[PDB]
Design a protein around this ligand. Structure first.
Ligand code: CFM
Ligand code: CLF
Ligand SMILES: [Ca+2]
Ligand SMILES: [Ca+2]
Lengths: 522, 478, 522
């Protein structure tokens, strides 16, 4: 039933007796589910070191990964350029998935097309799909540029994107001068970040390679900035803020902050502001290039140093105090712009926030995951706060990166009990938070299930999740937040401290029992 | 309004398309006219989507793992291929279930063989085998496994059938090899057909020789209800209330056991025609189990179905059916009494998968709303025939509508509310048109049956008459 | 005992058996506390309408007020002016309290002095305290200005601040030209906000009254802005941001954003940037004056209109969509500066956030409290989101204000079941959240005890607190947040939506039982 005045949705609804009873009968009648005892048993088992060991012995099965295939990154990278339309040459299924994946994280429209290759397109090789697809795409959505990415299908069948595109132009399907940069993004290699890398490098090649003759380093008096796979509007904005705050001529390559934040005013802007093609063509003329997230911009680094001849600084993702300092100082050196008292004060304030909260932070053990750079940085900041990143997991991480983080950990007493895990999925982490239980875990929405699992063992075993990363689907607008620079640092610090206090208030909310420690002031 | 103004609209939009694409698209845009029962009325469906026109379709994988196979609780489904399909698909669909996720139920999880380059070049057929063992070891309580082929698997030609048969025989576990390679077909549609065939060949037959199950004259089965937000449950409660015994729900709070039990049901109630009709026909021609379609969207439709269903049985059932209708009458009545006035005469446009675009029409009319246009992503002409008797004369119809099309159509039609998918939502919200997700119920409760109707009603009002809509334009502008 | 490796503080410590047993014996042995039954009984009683009625019949007893005495406001107001030192003529006890009260909310130093009046100073009237106190204050802390406020003690004994100060100067205790504005702030009248009002008006009189001859409205081409009692650094900053974003010449009178956010860099800056005396002296020359929080700037309004001859616009606190629009448009009109596309877009984004979250918001009932303006505004925004501010409580509210809010509520279907409560303390509200239980409550840290109480009745009776207002002592750095303008609106919206989702995740975290609705995407 339903009480019109106070309608109950799925949640309170299926808790009504008639419903409960129905499910009970359904279960006992046709589900043949394992006895509650067996269930409870196997569960307690999944929390033991014995289980965890077998769990880590996995060589084939991947459960609850902490990554996505290349094309996703290629698309995001594509969205960073002015009136550019992401075009994924391959199965249409992927594109639908990409769009929705981003739709849910940004709560914004996500324009992307596929040339819809099917059975015979795979067998015969979809060159026509490329031709018609490009023509149709331009004519219908009138984009200024089309960024081609790929699907495993197109990668297996070796569809020569370049050949196809070239022939597409030569056969009059699209104007010969229409910018159609491409990039091979095999789903089965690297991850989404690699896709971002490949896509960017391809675009960089497109507007540069040939025209390298008239280019001269530093002539434009700008500093190129490559964000890489970034899913926080605040992260793009903070970099641009600081740069402008210093009066540093810069050029953010792949800036979709606008596309991912179109104002709702009765009008739909498919495309929005982004990196102008001219900025890309002129990019080689820049003083240098700073890669905000170096660990997944490998191919781009080689192209920039090799072709653009830019001496890319060995800088870490500008996360946390130290790294942000290094970033600013490096930029300062390259541009000759002194760090304004504006930023100096901001740094001081963050330190002040750290000092005000060091009490609660000091000692808190965390488990975390996400992209290489993000994680690496998060770790550094955690260390600066006096916290312990015991379980550092980066599914899409590599041997060298692990070493880097290990060295970072070996540089601080707080990293003493930390352990970096590469090529490990969230199911592995689930075991880690059970066996060697941390205080909280920092990660994307996928971790909410780990917290569900942990709590199911017991309240004192519950490891609260702190949503920082990608993707965040169960929380509205967190994508606006910042993690980079002092600003991002301050936000993260605040978030952490308050998360700690929250759980404490809960734990001490028990009247008569634990409420004695329920302090008004903390 | 008026097919002439509409036909002009269709023809106007088609103008941007290069001759080739223009020619094709015209065949998928049509002005409805009841009585017409075919494609005659300029409407062809289930065909290759035009490249570059940004369609909203999916892949065969989505058809199998996404909608049909994924929903099964006590069964582990392996997204066989590169990471991505599984990840993007992980817990996207709200096919609700009851289980201890991780120990006996696994829906929420994303099991994948995380294909890496060497697995393609050398064929991950060995990887799969090793994977299965790891699964049995780490998830003892699974009652079966299913490999969902992603594009790569289809191309490289991995003998997944054999891996399944060999490992299955060894481990004494049901392992179902599904060839739902994304590229195979034209949408999620074929994925359904494939998944159905897989069920037929690898699961259904399992209990044919077994006669231990105690059947009753009222044993029914709900097929084609994925319990989105609890949809199946809200439908089941009604059926059972009128004396029926729902032996199994197909891909709702479904277990492999009840699926195997299905061949013992006296009647199959098909909700989602497009996805289950295949297996329904098979169960008939083989086990002689008759099947009928039905609708639970809105009281009129629900009641209509409840009666038609009870009519297939004896009087005890029919008599009970009336008691049920009587019981819920004051409720849904109170619902319309409150909400209808707020939604009276409000025009709505839709676009969904391959059922809802026509099925929800009834519910809308029950709240006094008018569906000025609707369309499907993957529906075949089968559905379109049925669609025409539901749509009011001169309403717009579209198959595999391109993004650009939906936009322009909406521009002139100017509906008061639009119901479509996630990839659409924000686009129209930007335009200032109240949008409501008709795939995921916009994270809301069930819509099926009477209890679901109350929720559906509240939701429509909630959004359609939300104050946020008046504030789109800044006062300093006109 | 204690395990050196894992030391347990007060919380986990007193839960150890030997400790529990000790308390049990203590209780049963010498406390003579009421039987657990009686306790449980009286508690259930305090949640009934019967209790609530008797609770509302109170005419003398005030329990858990939602306000503070005038001097607190006077002090905060004082801190907003360049190198100014708050001086409270009266008992030293107050000053210690004021400082700490703010110390805890801002987590910053709070400089304020008292002339320490004692027994004989009260009997004989502390004129000497004023003399010596002022001389000593200047000489020791070298402030450029001293803002005199009062304590009930000094207010009862009618200490003529003006006479005292005048004589202090004439008798050579301080330079005759040293700026010593004063204000009478009786603890027992109005509240802290009134103190802020009085203090400001006194300062405005000091640098204006006499020198009104050479003043001409609009001559300085600036728009005066009076923030009023504001305890969110972000609230000052957002106003200044928008104004600068429009290119509007403005002058924020009483700007302590700097003083309340000194960077921790090994140096202690007692005083920081603030409103320069010149800005105050030149203030009459402004085009007009906008009062961000009109409801507690009454006396100032009369002085501005009366003496400064400024036609102060009837504007509401710039909170939420509508009011922020009105504020901007009014400012636009007064300054002749068109609202930049910068702000227009920002408005659009907020609307977009509203549209993206309207689903979860629509229908949520809230209980809230705080200062008049803050509350009034919070209500308006709540209505704009489609939420229902059922229990609107403003202890320091007045008859006219109640009417204003009522009219606002009568303007929207969502205000249908709302009820404004003036002169009501948190104990009254406690009853309201028990009898007519709302979904969440928005307020200061004092509400954490109401949530404690609610939960003690049962989980389904627990009404989570959303910390927005003053003071917030149990959460680090929330004082940096913003509530004003679209920026503040966005933050509040995000905070609310996420608060809702949080509680939902908790409610649906029960594995097997309620976790079926534990959606990854929301
Ligand atoms: S878009 Fe149903 S034919 Fe299929 S996931 Fe939705 S309108 Fe599907 S009713 Fe169903 S539970 Fe669906 S809502 Fe047929 S199962 S491929 Mo997207
Ligand atoms: S249409 Fe469908 S989702 Fe596409 S591939 Fe084909 S079965 Fe799969 Fe998979 S990893 Fe990513 S999303 Fe692909 S590019 Fe490969
Ligand atoms: Ca949006
Ligand atoms: Ca501080």
């Amino acid at each position: 039933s339903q009480q019109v005045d106070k309608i109950k949705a799925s949640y309170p609804l299926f808790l009504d007796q008639d419903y409960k009873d129905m499910l009970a009968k359904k279960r006992d009648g046709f589900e043949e589910k394992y006895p509650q005892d067996k269930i409870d048993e196997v569960f307690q088992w999944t929390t033991t070191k014995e289980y965890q060991e077998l769990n880590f012995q996995r060589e084939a099965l991947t459960v609850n990964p902490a990554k996505a295939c290349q094309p996703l990154g290629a698309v995001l990278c594509a969205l960073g350029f002015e009136k550019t339309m992401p075009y994924v040459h391959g199965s249409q299924g992927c594109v639908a998935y990409f769009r929705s994946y981003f739709n849910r994280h940004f709560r914004e429209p996500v324009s992307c097309v596929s040339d819809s290759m099917t059975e015979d397109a795979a067998v015969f090789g979809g060159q026509q799909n490329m031709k018609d697809g490009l023509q149709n795409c331009k004519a219908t959505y009138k984009p200024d540029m089309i960024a081609v990415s790929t699907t495993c299908m197109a990668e297996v069948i070796g569809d020569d994107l370049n050949a196809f595109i070239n022939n597409s132009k030569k056969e009059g399907f699209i104007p010969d001068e229409f910018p159609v940069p491409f990039a091979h993004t095999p789903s089965f290699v690297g991850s989404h970040v690699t896709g971002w890398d490949n896509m960017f490098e391809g675009i960089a090649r497109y507007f540069t390679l040939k025209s390298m003759d008239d280019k001269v380093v530093g002539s434009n008096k700008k500093i190129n900035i490559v964000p890489g796979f970034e899913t926080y509007l605040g992260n793009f904005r903070v970099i641009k803020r600081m740069l402008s705050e210093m009066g540093v001529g810069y050029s953010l390559l792949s800036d979709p902050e606008e596309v991912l934040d179109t104002p709702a005013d009765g009008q739909f802007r498919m495309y929005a502001g982004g990196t102008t093609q001219e900025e890309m063509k002129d990019a080689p003329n820049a003083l240098n290039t700073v890669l905000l997230q170096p660990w997944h911009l490998e191919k781009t680094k080689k192209f920039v140093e090799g072709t653009w001849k830019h001496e890319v600084p060995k800088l870490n993702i500008p996360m946390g105090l130290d790294w942000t300092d290094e970033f600013l100082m490096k930029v300062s050196e390259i541009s000759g712009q002194p760090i304004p008292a504006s930023l100096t004060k901001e740094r001081g304030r963050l330190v002040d926030m750290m000092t005000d909260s060091h009490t609660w932070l000091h000692g808190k053990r965390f488990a975390l995951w996400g992209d290489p750079d993000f994680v690496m940085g998060l770790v550094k900041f955690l260390l600066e706060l006096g916290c312990e990143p015991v379980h550092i997991l980066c599914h899409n991480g590599n041997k060298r990166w692990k070493k880097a983080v290990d060295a970072i950990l070996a540089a601080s007493p707080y990293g003493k009990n930390a352990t970096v895990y590469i090529g490990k999925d969230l199911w592995h982490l689930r075991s880690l938070v059970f066996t060697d239980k941390p205080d909280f875990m920092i990660g994307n929405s996928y971790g909410k299930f780990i917290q569900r699992d942990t709590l199911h063992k017991g309240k004192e075993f519950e490891v609260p999740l702190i949503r920082i990363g990608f993707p965040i689907f169960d929380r509205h607008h967190l994508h606006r937040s910042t993690t980079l620079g002092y600003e991002g640092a301050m936000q993260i610090l605040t978030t952490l401290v308050n998360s700690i206090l929250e759980r404490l208030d809960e734990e001490t909310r028990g009247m008569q029992a634990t409420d004695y420690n329920h302090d008004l002031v903390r | 309004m008026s097919r002439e103004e509409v036909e002009s609209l269709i023809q106007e939009v088609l103008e941007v398309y290069p001759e080739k694409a223009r020619k094709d698209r015209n065949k998928h845009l049509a002005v409805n006219d009841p009585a017409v029962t075919q494609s005659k009325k300029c409407i062809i469906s289930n065909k290759k989507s035009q490249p570059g026109l940004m369609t909203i379709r999916g892949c065969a994988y989505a058809g199998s793992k996404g909608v049909v196979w994924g929903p099964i609780k006590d069964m582990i489904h392996i997204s066989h291929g590169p990471v991505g399909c599984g990840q993007y698909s992980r817990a996207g669909r709200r096919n609700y279930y009851i289980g201890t996720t991780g120990v006996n139920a696994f829906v929420t999880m994303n099991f994948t063989s995380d294909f890496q380059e060497k697995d393609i070049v050398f064929g991950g057929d060995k990887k799969l085998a090793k994977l299965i063992d790891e699964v049995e070891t780490l998830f003892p309580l699974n009652k079966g496994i299913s490999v969902q082929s992603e594009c790569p698997i289809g191309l490289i030609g991995d003998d997944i059938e054999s891996v399944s048969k060999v490992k299955g025989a060894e481990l004494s576990k049901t392992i179902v090899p599904v060839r739902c390679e994304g590229f195979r077909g034209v949408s999620q549609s074929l994925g359904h057909h494939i998944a159905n065939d897989a069920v037929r060949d690898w699961v259904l037959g399992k209990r044919d020789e077994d006669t231990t199950f105690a059947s009753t004259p009222y044993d029914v089965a709900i097929i084609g209800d994925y319990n989105i937000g609890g949809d199946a449950w809200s439908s089941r409660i009604l059926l059972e209330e009128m004396g029926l015994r729902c032996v199994a729900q197909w891909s709702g709070d479904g277990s492999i056991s009840e699926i195997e039990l299905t061949p013992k049901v006296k009647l199959n109630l098909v909700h989602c025609y497009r996805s289950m009709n295949y297996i329904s026909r098979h169960m008939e021609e083989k086990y002689g189990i008759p099947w009928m379609e039905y609708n639970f969207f809105g009281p009129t439709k629900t009641i209509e179905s409840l009666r038609a269903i009870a009519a297939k049985f004896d009087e005890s059932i029919q008599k009970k059916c009336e008691e049920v209708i009587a019981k819920y009458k004051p409720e849904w009545e109170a619902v319309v009494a409150k909400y209808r006035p707020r939604l009276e005469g409000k025009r709505v446009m839709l676009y969904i998968g391959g059922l809802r675009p026509r099925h929800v029409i009834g519910a809308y009319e029950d709240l006094g709303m008018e569906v000025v246009g609707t369309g499907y992503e993957f529906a075949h002409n089968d559905d379109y025939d049925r669609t025409m008797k539901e749509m009011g004369d001169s309403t717009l119809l579209y198959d595999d509508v391109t993004g650009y099309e939906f936009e322009e159509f909406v521009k002139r039609i100017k509906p008061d509310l639009i119901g479509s998918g996630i990839k659409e939502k924000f686009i129209f919200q930007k335009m200032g048109i109240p949008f409501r997700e008709m795939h995921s119920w916009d994270y809301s409760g069930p819509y099926h049956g009477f209890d679901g109707f109350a929720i559906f009603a509240r939701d429509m009002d909630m959004t359609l008459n939300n104050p946020c809509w008046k504030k789109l334009q800044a006062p300093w502008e006109a």
